[PDB]
RNA sequence: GCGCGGACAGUAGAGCAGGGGAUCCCCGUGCUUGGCGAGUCCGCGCACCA
RNA sequence: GAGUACGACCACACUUGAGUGAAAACACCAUAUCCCGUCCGAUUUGUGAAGUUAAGCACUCACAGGCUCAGUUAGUACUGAGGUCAGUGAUGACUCGGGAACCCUGAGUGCCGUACUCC
RNA sequence: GGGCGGCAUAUCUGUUACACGACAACGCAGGUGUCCUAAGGCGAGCUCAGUGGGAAUCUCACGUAGAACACAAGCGUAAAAGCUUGCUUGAUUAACGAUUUCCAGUACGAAUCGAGACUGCGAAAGCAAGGCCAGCGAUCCUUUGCGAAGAAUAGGAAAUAUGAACAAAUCAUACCAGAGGUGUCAGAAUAAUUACCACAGGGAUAACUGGCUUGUGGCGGCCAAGCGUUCAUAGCGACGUCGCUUUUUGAUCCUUCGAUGUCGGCUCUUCCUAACCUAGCGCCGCAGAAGACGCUAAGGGUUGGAUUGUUCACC
RNA sequence: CGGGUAAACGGCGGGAGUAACUAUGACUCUCUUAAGGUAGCCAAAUGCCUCGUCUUCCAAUUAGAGACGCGCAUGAAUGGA
RNA sequence: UCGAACCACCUAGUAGCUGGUUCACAUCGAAGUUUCCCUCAGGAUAGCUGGUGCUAGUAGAAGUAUUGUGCGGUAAAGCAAAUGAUUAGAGGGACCUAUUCUCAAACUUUAAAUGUGCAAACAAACCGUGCCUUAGCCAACUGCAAGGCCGGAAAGAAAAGAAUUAGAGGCACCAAGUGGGCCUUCUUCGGUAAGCGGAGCAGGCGAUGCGGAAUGAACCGCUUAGGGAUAUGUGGCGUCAAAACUUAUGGGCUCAUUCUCGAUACGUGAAAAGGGUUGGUGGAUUCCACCGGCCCCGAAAAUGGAUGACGCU
């Protein structure tokens, strides 16, 4: 079976990335890096939580796959599944290696995990008011699924965008914000004067 | 395992960002005398007459020049005594170093207060130690605390 | 590595002292003698008993050898050699293509 | 896709002024510019021609950090003061640019009527005295990026420099009537051009067909009549060298200051919104 | 390193791959350089002090 | 106030769009008997002067892109020295010192020589 | 540990490497014993890879090099260091000049700056004694080249020397420069087996106990998708995550090699608990009987046999 | 070079289809050697897997015997039975 | 006596290996690293050490600053900059355009701290357009180069934070032992890890005791002629055990039942997770959520036993 992640929660060594110089990485267990409805627009979503890291580790990548489907579940049950936008923000991109104290030591890989830091970003659930309870309880379980210690805190942000969430409304309604996606920039007052830019 | 000429030289001997090319003319057009003071700072571009990499950010005086080249001897420790390496190098691989500029101009100022003195004329005023006391009238005076607002900006999120 | 046949080279001598040319042949050693002072010596020493005297070289490990070229002067006798790179195919060719 | 964008003109690094003016050829310059060493930075002179559409140029100039020094210049345009008052950018005019600019920079020197060099234009080679009596003075030749062909107009300077007391090393190969079969010149050929029998015998042509050599026949400028005009005009510049032709407002536009211009930016932006 | 035999028999023919008629015949096909001397590859039998 | 030739530093000089240009230049330009070179007087070479600023070039403009110098980021990140410091630990703060970078924002948009020539 | 394997044995890039230099691993990713008369030298023209518009390869714009430069890599290079082409042999010689790298500041290999000769290219300034940086070799021996002729009354400024009583001609030596090679690459001329075995030693080094570790084995917690008619938790528990234990095996090599008797069984005593039975008690899906799970508890008990050396196993 | 000689030393093959259900394969195609293990014998003092499978022996059989043979690696004076 | 008998002799065979190697105290005092070696249990070689000295005793000094002037691409930062890796939408199935989620030992525009070259007036440098010399450079030169000679001036280096020195420099000769190291702090490479294996810097032990951490080569303190007094360091002050004969006319917190709560720097007994007491923050009408302190649970091993023992609340 599969060496506990325990025994690869040390870290201390040089990043080791799937390169050309280092072959055989099997892929990582998690690929959805974005559960619920991606496509909702910023203005639907004013509520932000994300889950804080609290230490300097290393998280394999199945503990990550397993966070996001115990976040989806419960969202599912307990709310729906187009009220809520959950990103995965860690990416395992250090490969883990396997000796299968011996000659010519030096192991193969057999997994890939994220370095991940103290005040890093792990989740980020993008909700509305009403359904903050849910995203509370959601996001513990999905933090028991994680090693070391997390911290669940609101973000005071608009969703995922970079505004606060208390002055978003009045520069949209300001039409200073452009809108792209899931996230909006705002705009600066340089460059040609197009029918954007005015504002 | 591999030691090199130029092992170990891909930043060293590599031209620094959106300043890549051949040497320039003032380069070309610097005299250079024995008793000179030079830098050797290899020029990647050349790669002829190319210091080793030791000898890259050293300075050292000018024994001999040839045609196209420049001698200089290097202070090089090794073990319990420092050595006087001659190298070789063209050129375009030694800067005039301004080791004494100091120094020169230190005995030019004494040259010009001894002739202004031969001559009576007015020395200049003598600057004042910064460290000596007196009396502060300040403009404006503000409390130094630590407030609420510290504290809760510094906070992300 | 293909080669000229001949060549045009400073000659060296009082004859041509100038650039002239030369005539192309590879080296090739010549035949040991039997009555070179170290094959006298060493016949000496290998007769009678005792077996082999000296080492025999076996742990060859070289697969090409240094080319050398005689070149002649078309004025004089004068040879003079030259030591190229080692190299598995030395040919002399004209074709210069 | 792009290739001109943002990242693009971030790499970027800009060619020298006078290479992308497309006007030094710097590998050139600098082992034009170059000197041994142990020469510790003494005088070194080229001799720079740059002929343009309508002006022949010529300068002795000398190499320095802050720019480079111009000791003496002589002017394809400047010759009318001397007779030759057509033609002024071919042969014949770039001969007699090169020997006034050798006689006004020797003059300059002191050293002439020391170095006379030949009196009379034959066309024929000698080899220069260099260093590599009392030794002329000496100039390397410039081209800068004009095609070194046989006959060009930049060696027709230089045989005038020679023929005015120069020592600028050269070989005949590009003197015109070098024929590179046989390895030798034609002497005659070379002293035709640069008396201008060639164009002589093209205007005598051009007067048989019955828009060019117009300046010419404007005047009567009899084809028969060219050389004694070359001959007296080189006769006349090594007379007198420093002879030359015979002798605020402003255009400049207003830049608008920073402030100027932004205000103008937020007045467009206020008229903008209003109209919309 | 030295000697030999061979690049089928030779002083350019023979075997035979592909060709017309009833296994027969007929078209084809084939080691270098020099005026008989000096090189390249296979083998054999022999030499071995850097 | 400009131009040409040679230049030094090599974007505050570059790139993209538009606009204006006195004189003299610069250049487009016209042409191939000769020197010379091309499949092609396209380039290049020779000889020239009927025309034109249309382009090159020079100056102006752009809430232009780059670039340069500032500030902000921030005494933050990181770090030399210390503890029988805290913490299970990962780590962290503290004590004596050093001290960034990007994002973003403000300003700016070549300059110094030699000679010769035009206003 | 040794053996088998491999080459970390000579050696080159990048990284390891900690912003001078130096820096190890049977560390990582790769190279090297060649190849080139042009793939060397020089001059001159030209611009590459890719795009876009257009012609049943040719065209015009863009194009900071995203190509190329023999071969691995790094660096460098755009009127070139690339491509084409013209003519060349500086890939020669070079008076024992100096220097760098390795370093003992020794050689070897590779480099760098020169002085002289004779030259190539170029109008010229200049640029070239190989292809930048890896691509290679002591003594002794063998072997080749150089010491043309013509001069001198006398060994000189300029005639190679010797074979020792001496003269000629051979022959053999010598002096300088190279080649033939040592890859264990500072350079012996080398097949196995030993259980019939021997010696000096080694705990600098393996096999057995003990020690560190705990991957592997073993035994547990947390969270809660699910299984349980229904119902996350009576019972259990995916996918994750945190432990504990030394009853397994591996890893190490610290103790012992002038010796710590080595598997199992037998016999005998003692200890532990993560509890099979025996005593109490909770709880279940607990009607009763039989059971499941848990708690306190190690006081007491836990067999007889077939096959197997067995421990394990399973009858 | 050319012959002879195994009671000289010794050696003595695979993969790819096939018979009215399934099988396994008399049959066939092929790759191939100096020859391809014949008569016999066997989980044998020779069988790794293995305590092989079946029968018998016992209440119970990693043992014994009799069978079976895809024989890691049985076999004919290296003598087989 | 036999995988080559016995006796005498060559033979005191050779051994890079094992064992031994005999009086005192005095002055000094290491190395386990470099290069080469059929070299790895051994040598040569340089270094470290001793003994000789030689030389004009403050000189040509410095494991340190400062000021001036060079060198650098590691930490950090970046992917809205090149090269590679990478999630998702948005505008013109894919492509593009603007970015956005994440990031690299063999990526980087930028870029520290700590470092590392050179200089900071006595064989030097400065001034004179001073003289001589040169087959050197330059077209020549009174210009440039080089060696000298003749003089002048020299806070002998001011002032501006504007150094300091238990700061005599140079030069040799002859030799020993070492050439198995190991530990720790920061930095780290391989390994799940190791009291594992390999490196960088610096201190150590080895070679070294003394005082202290009960005990311990290496931790803390301090390092040492043999004696007294006084005072400290680290560590202590209930008894063991010198010191509060159990100090204060100091504030809080803490209860713990067979594993003993705590008093364990290094280090030598722990987590995820959860709940008595008394603190904090933010809301609602005393309760709601959240965050600390101390304590408790989570917490199972084999002889009887260990904050060192007793004990202390
Ligand atoms: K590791
Ligand atoms: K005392
Ligand atoms: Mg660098
Ligand atoms: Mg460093
Ligand atoms: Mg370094
Ligand atoms: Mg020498
Ligand atoms: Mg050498
Ligand atoms: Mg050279
Ligand atoms: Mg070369
Ligand atoms: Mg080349
Ligand atoms: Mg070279
Ligand atoms: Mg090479
Ligand atoms: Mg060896
Ligand atoms: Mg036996
Ligand atoms: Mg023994
Ligand atoms: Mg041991
Ligand atoms: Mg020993
Ligand atoms: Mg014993
Ligand atoms: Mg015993
Ligand atoms: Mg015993
Ligand atoms: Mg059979
Ligand atoms: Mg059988
Ligand atoms: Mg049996
Ligand atoms: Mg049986
Ligand atoms: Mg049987
Ligand atoms: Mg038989
Ligand atoms: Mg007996
Ligand atoms: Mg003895
Ligand atoms: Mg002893
Ligand atoms: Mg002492
Ligand atoms: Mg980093
Ligand atoms: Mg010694
Ligand atoms: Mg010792
Ligand atoms: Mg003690
Ligand atoms: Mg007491
Ligand atoms: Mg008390
Ligand atoms: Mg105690
Ligand atoms: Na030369
Ligand atoms: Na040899
Ligand atoms: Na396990
Ligand atoms: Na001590
Ligand atoms: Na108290
Ligand atoms: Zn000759």
Known sequence: ?199 | ?157 | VNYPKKKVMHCGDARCNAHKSFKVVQYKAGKARLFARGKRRYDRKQSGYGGQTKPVFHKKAKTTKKIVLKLQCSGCKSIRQVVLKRTKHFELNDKKK | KVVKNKAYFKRFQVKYRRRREGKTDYHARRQMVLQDKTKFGSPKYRLVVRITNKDIIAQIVQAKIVGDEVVMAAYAHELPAFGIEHGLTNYAAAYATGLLLARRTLAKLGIADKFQGAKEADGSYSAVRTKKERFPFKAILDVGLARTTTGARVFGVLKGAVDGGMAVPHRPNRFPGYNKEKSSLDAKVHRDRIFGKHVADYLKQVKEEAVQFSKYMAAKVLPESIEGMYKKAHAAIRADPSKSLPKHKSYKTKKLSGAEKRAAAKAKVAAIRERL
């Open chain 1, 1 to 199: 079976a599969r060496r506990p992640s325990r025994c690869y929660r040390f870290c201390k060594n040089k990043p080791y990335p799937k390169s050309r110089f280092c072959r055989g990485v099997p892929d990582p267990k998690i690929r959805n890096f974005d559960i619920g409805r991606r496509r909702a627009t910023v203005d639907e979503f004013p509520v932000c939580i994300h889950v804080v890291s609290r230490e300097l580790e290393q998280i394999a990548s199945e503990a990550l796959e397993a966070a996001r489907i115990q976040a989806n579940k419960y969202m599912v049950k307990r709310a729906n599944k187009d009220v809520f936008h959950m990103r995965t923000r860690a990416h395992p991109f250090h490969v883990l290696r396997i000796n299968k104290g011996m000659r010519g030591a030096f192991g193969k890989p057999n997994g890939v995990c994220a370095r991940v830091r103290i005040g890093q970003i792990l989740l980020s659930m993008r909700t509305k008011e009403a359904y903050v309870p849910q995203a509370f309880e959601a996001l513990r379980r999905a933090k028991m699924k994680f090693p070391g210690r997390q911290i669940i805190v609101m973000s005071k942000y608009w969703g995922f965008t970079n505004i606060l969430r208390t002055e978003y409304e009045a520069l949209r309604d300001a039409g200073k914000l452009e809108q792209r996606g899931t996230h909006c920039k705002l705009i600066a007052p340089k460059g040609k004067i197009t029918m954007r830019n005015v504002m």
């Open chain 2, 1 to 157: 395992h591999s030691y090199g000429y130029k092992s170990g030289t891909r930043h060293l001997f590599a031209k620094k960002f959106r300043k890549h090319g051949v040497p320039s003319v003032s380069t070309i057009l610097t005299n250079i005398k024995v008793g000179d003071y030079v830098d050797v700072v290899a020029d990647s571009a050349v790669r002829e007459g190319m210091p080793h990499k030791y000898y890259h950010g050293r300075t050292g005086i000018v024994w001999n020049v040839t045609p196209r080249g420049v001698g200089v001897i290097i202070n090089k420790p090794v073990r319990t005594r420092t050595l006087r390496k001659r190298i070789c190098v063209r050129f375009e691989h030694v800067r005039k170093s301004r080791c004494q500029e100091a120094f020169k101009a230190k005995e030019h100022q004494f040259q010009a207060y001894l002739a202004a003195k031969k001559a009576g004329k007015a020395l200049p005023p003598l600057q004042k130690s910064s460290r000596l006391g007196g009396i502060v009238r300040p403009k404006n005076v503000e409390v130094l605390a630590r407030r609420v607002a510290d504290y809760e900006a510094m906070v992300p999120y």
